[PDB]
């Protein structure tokens, strides 16, 4: 009985993920991906048909056509409105499987698919702590460090893989306390992140998604740093101490002057606000350095931004600078002229704290 172009029903395709022949498995996975692409119904179906644990399982298959295949299917299944598809991948240990494959990925294409999938999964709160717990060290050591071009002991590459990965990490650090603690205390991670951003800015790129993701990530990690950093009792600064060194601060300020991307503008302001928030030595120093002419205007200037979220970031920043301002003049000068409902309260709480 000679071969043909029969198209199988979804249940069959799923059944074939388990067939003896590897070529059947891989082509099934491939096809599965195609069927899901831009198709929410099919994706949700694959879940209800119990295909997800089967795909997750193939991530362990020795042959690349099969694992790459499964992984590309999972990628599509992990994207879209049906947040239960993401949960499903998590619930059958997708993340440790993905990580396990990552450790042995050798090529960009597979790495591309894995990290993108992780990025997709990371958009979902129920999965963030999972990724933090199982993917942090591999994402850091296998992806960020090697490809960043950074070196503890002094070129950037694989921009796409990096973006996916910085996006994933941005995502899992958006809210959780010990997600921030884990990430920022992860040797090399902050170092490399900053290195990435310099690299981009040295290419006159202050808008790339890769820059955006790294900065939102840095923003999160800066949140409450004066407090959550080991021995918050306050030679070359390493790791999370880089979050509050002049080096990065100047990067934020240059992005405010150079970046035309709301996300980046907002996160750079947010970073500054975070660093300034603390009543601690480095807060005193950063805050003082920031109350200088060129910086104050760069910040204040985005109070005239079209985008609400960036307007709000600047306000928070400015209000933080005013707390121990020792030249009400400079700050008052640059803020006031320019200074939703929550936005209003912020701009108001800020005017107040400026004039004490």
């Amino acid at each position: 009985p000679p071969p043909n172009w029969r198209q199988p029903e979804l249940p069959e395709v799923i059944a074939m993920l388990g067939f003896r022949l590897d070529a059947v498995k891989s082509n099934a996975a491939a096809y599965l991906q195609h069927l899901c692409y831009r198709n929410d119904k099919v994706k949700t179906d694959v879940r209800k048909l119990k295909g997800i644990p089967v795909l997750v399982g193939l991530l362990d298959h020795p042959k690349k056509e099969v694992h790459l295949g499964a992984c590309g299917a999972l990628k599509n299944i992990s994207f879209g409105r049906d947040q239960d598809n993401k949960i499903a991948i998590k619930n059958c240990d997708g993340v440790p499987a993905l990580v396990r494959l990552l450790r042995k990925a050798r090529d960009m294409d597979l790495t591309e698919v894995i990290t993108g999938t992780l990025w997709n999964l990371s958009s979902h709160d129920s999965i963030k702590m999972e990724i933090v717990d199982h993917a942090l060290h591999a994402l850091t050591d296998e992806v960020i460090i090697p490809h960043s071009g950074w070196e503890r002991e002094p070129h950037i590459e694989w921009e796409s893989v990096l973006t996916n990965t910085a996006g994933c990490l941005r995502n899992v650090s958006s809210e959780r306390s010990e997600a921030r603690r884990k990430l920022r205390e992860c040797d090399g991670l902050v170092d490399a992140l900053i290195f990435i951003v310099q690299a981009e800015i040295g290419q006159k790129d202050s808008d790339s998604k890769l820059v955006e993701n790294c900065v939102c990530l840095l923003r999160n990690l800066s949140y409450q740093v004066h407090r959550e950093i080991p021995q918050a009792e306050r030679s070359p600064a390493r790791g999370y101490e880089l979050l509050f060194q002049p080096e990065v601060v100047r990067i934020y300020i240059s992005l405010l002057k150079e970046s035309k991307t709301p996300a980046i503008l907002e996160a750079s302001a947010g970073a500054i606000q975070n660093l300034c928030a603390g009543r601690w030595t480095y807060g005193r120093y950063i805050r003082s350095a920031l109350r200088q002419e060129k910086a104050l205007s760069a910040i204040a200037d985005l109070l005239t931004n079209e985008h609400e979220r960036v307007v709000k970031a600047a306000s928070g920043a400015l209000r933080n600078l005013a707390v121990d301002a020792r030249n009400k003049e400079l700050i008052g000068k640059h803020a006031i002229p320019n200074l939703s409902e929550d936005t209003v309260i912020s701009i108001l709480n800020t005017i107040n704290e400026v004039i004490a």
Binding site: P3, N4, W5, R6, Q7, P8, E12, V13, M16, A23, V24, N27, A28, A30, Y31, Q33, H34, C36, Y37, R38, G72, K75, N76, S78, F79, G80, T115, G116, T117, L118, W119, N120, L121, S122, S123, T163, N164, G167, R170, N171, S174, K209, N213
Partner: peptide, 18 residues
């Protein structure tokens, strides 16, 4: 948050399904 991974179409050999 943002599902930056997105999705892609994919190629396959239908004639091997079976």
């Amino acid at each position: 948050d943002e599902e930056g991974g997105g999705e892609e179409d994919q190629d396959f050999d239908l004639s091997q399904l079976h």
